[PDB]
Design a protein around this ligand. Structure first.
Ligand SMILES: *[C@@H]1O[C@H](CO)[C@@H](O[C@@H]2O[C@H](CO)[C@@H](O[C@@H]3O[C@H](CO[C@H]4O[C@H](CO)[C@@H](O)[C@H](O)[C@@H]4O)[C@@H](O)[C@H](O[C@H]4O[C@H](CO)[C@@H](O)[C@H](O)[C@@H]4O)[C@@H]3O)[C@H](O)[C@H]2NC(C)=O)[C@H](O)[C@H]1NC(C)=O
Ligand SMILES: *[C@@H]1O[C@H](CO)[C@@H](O[C@@H]2O[C@H](CO)[C@@H](O[C@@H]3O[C@H](CO[C@H]4O[C@H](CO)[C@@H](O)[C@H](O)[C@@H]4O)[C@@H](O)[C@H](O[C@H]4O[C@H](CO)[C@@H](O)[C@H](O)[C@@H]4O)[C@@H]3O)[C@H](O)[C@H]2NC(C)=O)[C@H](O)[C@H]1NC(C)=O
Ligand SMILES: *[C@@H]1O[C@H](CO[C@@H]2O[C@@H](C)[C@@H](O)[C@@H](O)[C@@H]2O)[C@@H](O[C@@H]2O[C@H](CO)[C@@H](O[C@@H]3O[C@H](CO)[C@@H](O)[C@H](O)[C@@H]3O)[C@H](O)[C@H]2NC(C)=O)[C@H](O)[C@H]1NC(C)=O
Ligand SMILES: *[C@@H]1O[C@H](CO[C@@H]2O[C@@H](C)[C@@H](O)[C@@H](O)[C@@H]2O)[C@@H](O[C@@H]2O[C@H](CO)[C@@H](O)[C@H](O)[C@H]2NC(C)=O)[C@H](O)[C@H]1NC(C)=O
Ligand SMILES: *[C@@H]1O[C@H](CO)[C@@H](O)[C@H](O)[C@H]1NC(C)=O
Ligand SMILES: *[C@@H]1O[C@H](CO)[C@@H](O)[C@H](O)[C@H]1NC(C)=O
Ligand SMILES: OC[C@H]1O[C@H](O)[C@H](O)[C@@H](O)[C@H]1O
Ligand SMILES: OC[C@H]1O[C@H](O)[C@H](O)[C@@H](O)[C@H]1O
Ligand SMILES: OC[C@H]1O[C@H](O)[C@H](O)[C@@H](O)[C@H]1O
Ligand SMILES: OC[C@H]1O[C@H](O)[C@H](O)[C@@H](O)[C@H]1O
Lengths: 387, 387
């Protein structure tokens, strides 16, 4: 979408994966979807280094809506959002952050809350802009393919007309199988800043691999359509939650980064461990994710030893390499050379290990190197020519 | 097997899952299959509370064999085991531990090392006894159904004839699909102390789940056949390795415990975290696993919320309950009562949460309770009557 927004992938926090549709504020006041939850997360983002590292979006997901008023104007749940959305937006802006909200192009949201039907698109866009929202996630439950085909372009146009810059996250392609001929990616890129192509992430390694596999199988289609202002969205980071081991957490971060994915966390920032914070706030990792070229990476090699190699081109003739072990046994000593990974001759390279900080220097194409990769884990290099 | 051994499930350490067939001691001297590795693990088991908690077996797996001498007698790899197996057993015995060894009923071991063919069964049994081995794991690679049907009883008879008590771990049923009519559990119970029924565990949550689900699907057959002296073996514990998150690690321990499974670790005891050590060395968990009745537990309840309940009867009218979440979203508040979990009578119970240590008092059959279960995680209760 040509609205000047998201020239690099959006970094932030999204409520959904961790907090879902928990509206029982009587039994569970600390973890229910509410004004309090978002304010407390905003506080952590501002105080604990998150905003400073680039995580700027605080996004509300499903289950915020209370109904529509006599004019058809959207309202939050009065008990869970007693001060309303402008209050929350103003609060988030006062901390140097941006606020995202959620709507559904259809009769209802996926959890059955009031939907943004075709005749409500313009009104709801105007409402969001008036509230000073900075991002909209438009889901596609309870609609037909033709309704979505009208509705997503209509919303992009309605948002534009408000005059407020609002980042547009579309779920349109996920509902149509994510692939040609039903999905037109040139069209999507003209109307959306980012799009959910595929299944909802769940808090499991199986879910991560399932998404990873789908994006890799279809990378010839998906890789070229990504760039500044228009990203593929493999869904939220699971880092800080229940399903991923340490190696797996490091793996998702590295793989989302080489895929030029949004770094949208969804975790309790109030209780996040130092170890998981270290992953998400890794400065070189973020630098790579936020590379100005915005070129999505690809899997470039697959071995029968079950080691996969991913490569992302970066600015200043630099590259990111992810050595990824799909093995389930033990650490694997992977022997290779840059020449075997299709690098150009005569150039001498240097690598910084993104997680350890270690520097490997004097790498010519023919230089043999060994990387030790843990099972379900990665080794990630930031690679650059040296003069 | 009526040899006076394993009246409770065996507890110890097995090399395979974590260290596999790593024989390259030139490049990896600290992690290769060698006498040093086993001596170092023995020291850890003696010094770090493992032995005193009940972890007594230290088991060599595949890839230890050098060959056969002129008389056809097995010898360990001379470079990797320079002092010989008797030296290692001596060392193990001096620390109050027991030594386990590996052989294969067939042409070769699964990794292609010399096999214990039918004409070598007796000689190998005598060799292990002379070496003062305490446990034998007999694999079934590179053999026919008829060879196994002859060989496993032949080895049991041979081991018996040596006069040395040697715990017998049989993989026979795993090569036969693990089920009747192809597997005869009445025979296995008479000739083996424990048997691998099913697939090799790998370092992943998916692997734990597939094993757990196979054992649950066939529990009507498998539950009754286990007891003092003869156990089902769902394979090694993964706790301390790479593939399991904290919740999943706590889950495998709890679930292996209610299944009256062996507690055979396979992890680097030199670098194991305190958090993982606290799981494996949990005194009440071990007490439950080592319960003198040796009655294997069952899944007693399954709900659409994807919460599963397991129950294991224990000595002194006590029970172990495992509330297991197969959800992949967020913590779940499970509402139940003992009466809904098929507890009868007017008995008043008290429960101790095995992980938190918390005590819940005044539980009658009708009393409503709530437990909070994390995704891919468990809540475990030790439940007992009070008067
Ligand atoms: C509502 O929708 C409209 C129409 O889509 C949006 O207006 C566009 O906004 C974008 C982003 O700000 C504009 O793109 C920028 O144009 C700059 C100059 O273009 C001029 O010249 C062309 C002809 O050559 C004219 O069409 C145009 O009117 C301008 O006069 C560029 O300099 C910018 O360059 C950026 O990208 C390059 C290359 O990637 C980088 O090197 C630079 O660093 C820089 O970031 C950029 O391309 C676009 O021109 C606007 N279109 C129109 C018709 O005005 C609104 O933004 C949108 N409003 C809201 C509220 O969402
Ligand atoms: C080769 O194979 C034979 C079996 O064919 C094995 O012999 C068995 O060995 C076990 C273990 O040593 C014996 O079990 C023990 O029996 C002891 C006495 O029981 C006798 O008396 C009763 C009278 O009612 C008879 O019914 C019974 O047949 C025996 O003759 C007990 O003292 C032992 O009790 C143990 O368990 C209790 C738990 O309640 C504890 O309190 C005790 O401390 C103790 O640990 C035990 O039950 C068994 O009797 C033998 N069977 C036969 C048929 O002889 C060989 O061991 C095996 N050889 C090798 C080396 O593997
Ligand atoms: C989006 O919503 C529209 C609007 O209708 C509204 O929502 C419905 C689910 C009902 O709750 C309505 O009371 C409400 O006005 C849906 O269009 C409507 O669908 C309903 C139910 O399918 C239709 O009523 C049915 O008519 C058939 C006869 O063909 C009977 O067999 C049924 O018993 C029932 O009475 C109704 O005609 C229709 N109304 C309009 C104005 O079109 C629409 O289905 C829904 N779209 C999607 C994609 O979910
Ligand atoms: C286990 O091995 C036996 C022994 O034969 C060995 O393997 C042969 C291929 C050859 O290399 C011999 O020198 C070895 O001693 C296998 O039994 C033989 O099977 C082969 C078929 O390849 C056949 O030619 C012979 O007649 C068989 N020998 C006898 C006398 O039994 C057996 O097949 C192997 N079992 C499994 C399941 O792998
Ligand atoms: C790299 O190592 C391989 C061993 O696999 C060796 O054959 C080759 O000569 C080495 N290449 C160079 C240029 O050192
Ligand atoms: C248990 O809870 C149910 C509602 O879930 C309630 O109807 C019932 O009265 C409770 N039972 C007791 C004994 O309090
Ligand atoms: O109910 C909200 C839920 O709806 C869909 O499933 C989306 O794909 C999820 O990301 C989430 O927004
Ligand atoms: O209907 C719920 C919906 O949620 C997401 O958008 C998924 O991508 C879809 O495949 C579907 O499961
Ligand atoms: O090769 C060693 C390997 O062989 C078989 O697959 C067994 O089931 C494993 O437990 C292990 O002993
Ligand atoms: O040789 C590996 C071995 O591992 C397990 O025991 C399987 O159940 C067997 O069928 C066999 O594949």
């Amino acid at each position: 979408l040509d609205n000047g927004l998201l020239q690099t992938p959006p970094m932030g926090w999204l409520a959904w994966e961790r907090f879902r549709c928990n509206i029982n504020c009587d039994e569970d006041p600390k973890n229910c979807i509410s004004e309090q939850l978002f304010m407390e997360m905003a506080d952590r983002m501002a105080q604990d280094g998150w905003r400073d590292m680039g995580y700027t979006y605080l996004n509300i997901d499903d289950c915020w809506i209370g109904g529509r008023d006599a004019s058809g104007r959207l309202m939050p749940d009065p008990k869970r959002f007693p001060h309303g959305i402008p209050f929350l937006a103003d609060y988030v802006h006062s901390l140097g952050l941006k606020l995202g909200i959620y709507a559904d192009m259809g009769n209802f949201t996926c959890m059955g809350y009031p939907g943004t039907t075709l005749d409500k698109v313009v009104q709801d866009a105007q409402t969001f802009a008036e509230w000073k929202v900075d991002m909209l996630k438009l889901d596609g439950c309870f609609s037909t393919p033709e309704e979505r085909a009208q509705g997503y372009p209509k919303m992009a146009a309605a948002l534009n007309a408000t005059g407020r810059p609002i980042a547009f996250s579309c779920s349109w392609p996920a509902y149509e199988g994510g692939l040609p001929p039903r999905v037109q990616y040139s069209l999507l890129a003209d109307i959306c800043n980012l799009w959910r192509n595929y299944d909802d992430i769940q808090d499991s390694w199986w879910s991560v691999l399932s998404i990873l596999n789908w994006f890799v199988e279809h990378q010839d289609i998906l890789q070229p359509v990504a760039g500044p202002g228009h990203w593929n969205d493999p869904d939220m980071l699971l880092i800080g939650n229940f399903g991923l081991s340490l190696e797996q957490s490091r793996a998702q971060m590295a793989l989302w980064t080489v895929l030029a994915a949004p770094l949208l966390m969804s975790t309790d920032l109030r209780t996040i461990s130092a170890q998981n914070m270290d992953i998400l706030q890794n400065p070189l990792m973020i630098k790579i994710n936020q590379d100005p070229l915005g070129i999505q990476g690809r899997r470039i090699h697959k071995e029968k030893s079950l080691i996969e190699v991913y490569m992302r081109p970066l600015s200043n003739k630099a590259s990111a390499l992810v050595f990824f072990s799909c093995r389930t046994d033990m650490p694997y000593r992977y022997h290779s050379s840059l020449g075997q990974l299709n690098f150009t001759g005569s150039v001498i390279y240097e690598a910084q290990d993104v997680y350890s900080g270690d520097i490997i220097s004097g790498l010519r194409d023919e230089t043999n190197f060994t990387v030790i990769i843990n099972p379900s884990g990665v080794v990630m290099w930031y690679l650059y020519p040296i003069k």
